[PDB]
Amino acid sequence: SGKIIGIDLGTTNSCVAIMDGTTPRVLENAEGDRTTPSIIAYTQDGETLVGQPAKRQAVTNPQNTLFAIKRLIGRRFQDEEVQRDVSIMPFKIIAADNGDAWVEVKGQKMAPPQISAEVLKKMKKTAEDYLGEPVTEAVITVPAYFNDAQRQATKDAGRIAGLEVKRIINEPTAAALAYGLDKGTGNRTIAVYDLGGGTFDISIIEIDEVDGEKTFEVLATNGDTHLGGEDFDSRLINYLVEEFKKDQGIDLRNDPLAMQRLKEAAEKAKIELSSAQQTDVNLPYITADATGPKHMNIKVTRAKLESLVEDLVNRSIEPLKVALQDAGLSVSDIDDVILVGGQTRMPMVQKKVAEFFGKEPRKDVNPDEAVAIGAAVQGGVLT
Ligand SMILES: Nc1ncnc2c1ncn2[C@@H]1O[C@H](COP(=O)(O)OP(=O)(O)O)[C@@H](O)[C@H]1O
Ligand SMILES: [Mg+2]
Numbered sequence: 001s002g003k004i005i006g007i008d009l010g011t012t013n014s015c016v017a018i019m020d021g022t023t024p025r026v027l028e029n030a031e032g033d034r035t036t037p038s039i040i041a042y043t044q045d046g047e048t049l050v051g052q053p054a055k056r057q058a059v060t061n062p063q064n065t066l067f068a069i070k071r072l073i074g075r076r077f078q079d080e081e082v083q084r085d086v087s088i089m090p091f092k093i094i095a096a097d098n099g100d101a102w103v104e105v106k107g108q109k110m111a112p113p114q115i116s117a118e119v120l121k122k123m124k125k126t127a128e129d130y131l132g133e134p135v136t137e138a139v140i141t142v143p144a145y146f147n148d149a150q151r152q153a154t155k156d157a158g159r160i161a162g163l164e165v166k167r168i169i170n171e172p173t174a175a176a177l178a179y180g181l182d183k184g185t186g187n188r189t190i191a192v193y194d195l196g197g198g199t200f201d202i203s204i205i206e207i208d209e210v211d212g213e214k215t216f217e218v219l220a221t222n223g224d225t226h227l228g229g230e231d232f233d234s235r236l237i238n239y240l241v242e243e244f245k246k247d248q249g250i251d252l253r254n255d256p257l258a259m260q261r262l263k264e265a266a267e268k269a270k271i272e273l274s275s276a277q278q279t280d281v282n283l284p285y286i287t288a289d290a291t292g293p294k295h296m297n298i299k300v301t302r303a304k305l306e307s308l309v310e311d312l313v314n315r316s317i318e319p320l321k322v323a324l325q326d327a328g329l330s331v332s333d334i335d336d337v338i339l340v341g342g343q344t345r346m347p348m349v350q351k352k353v354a355e356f357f358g359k360e361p362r363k364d365v366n367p368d369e370a371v372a373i374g375a376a377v378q379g380g381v382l383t
Helices: 052-060 080-086 112-131 148-160 171-178 229-248 256-272 302-315 317-327 347-357 370-381
Strands: 004-009 013-020 023-026 039-042 048-050 065-067 092-095 101-105 108-110 137-142 164-170 187-195 200-210 217-224 278-289 292-301 336-340
Touching: 004 112, 004 148, 004 171, 004 370, 013 112, 013 370, 023 370, 039 052, 039 112, 048 052, 048 112, 052 065, 052 256, 080 092, 101 112, 108 112, 112 137, 112 148, 137 148, 137 171, 137 370, 148 164, 164 171, 164 370, 171 187, 171 200, 171 336, 171 370, 187 347, 200 317, 217 317, 229 256, 229 292, 229 302, 256 278, 292 302, 302 317, 302 347, 317 347, 336 347, 336 370
Parallel strands: 004 137, 137 164, 187 336
Antiparallel strands: 004 013, 013 023, 039 048, 039 065, 092 101, 101 108, 187 200, 200 217, 278 292
């Protein structure tokens, strides 16, 4: 029946949503999850894995497990983001013959859109599995700061995935549509605070009712492309390494398998601490030595997590001030504050944002779902 999907093609994760009549519905993937890791593995035996199945095999296949491709897409190999990433990514980043930032996978040169297209194919299949019918139309989101090359390379990923890309929309504009900030009257200035797995974006968006149609303008954009939830995980991981050093003599940083388990356990404990006051990190058989297997069992309070990440939360505030100054505005000129991204579910982040703007952020949608939902709302406007 010709159905247009909304896709959040995120740095860390991806989300796919749809109009179910008048109501947006985020879809569950083949693994039962409403979010799919933006991770693509080319296995030794010839399979292409995407999402949590690729995440599981990553430490067995570091060369051919790709992730963070949103950092490369539409960029040149000499871009400062790309040069920073060359020495930290375990997969091989290369210059194309035209100077573009490409990847080499099992000896094959590939452009970033060919890799991101595997994420988009999974979002497409995820929609087809829920609907019981083909899906070939999409709205896809990008950061507001993306230039024509990054937008066009994102379009190219959709085309390679077999999607007719009806429209590339800004992420904070999609978030405004999901929060229903179009079902209003007059002028409306909004702050979109977006804290994902890898990036922090602040966008100030003006929204005028004029001539019966609603205008949308990005007045200012700021942030930090190296501030996200993975950095919050890293603070908890480093705490868990040092407590296990103190209590059992072992530096777990030597054991790269123990470290894959510890990262996973730190993220789970962080996420539990958004709704509980304390949790346990319990990893049986975490490592072993001459005296046999060791077991990690460490209580983590929410207050301990908050102390480990406070300066990361405080880094998000200076780009808010600069964004307001570039827009020519004060906190009182902001009518609505919306949160986007899974890391904004943390009570400390919500409270710091509410405190800075002097108003409680809206609650209409999940922060981690807003970009995909708004892409779907925009798709339904074109249906
Ligand atoms: N309830 C939660 N509490 C704290 N952090 C969370 C929670 N849910 C998800 N996160 C974190 O949010 C990040 C995912 O952000 P997300 O918006 O999905 O990424 P993307 O940048 O790809 O849009 C991860 O670091 C994840 O651990
Ligand atoms: Mg995001």
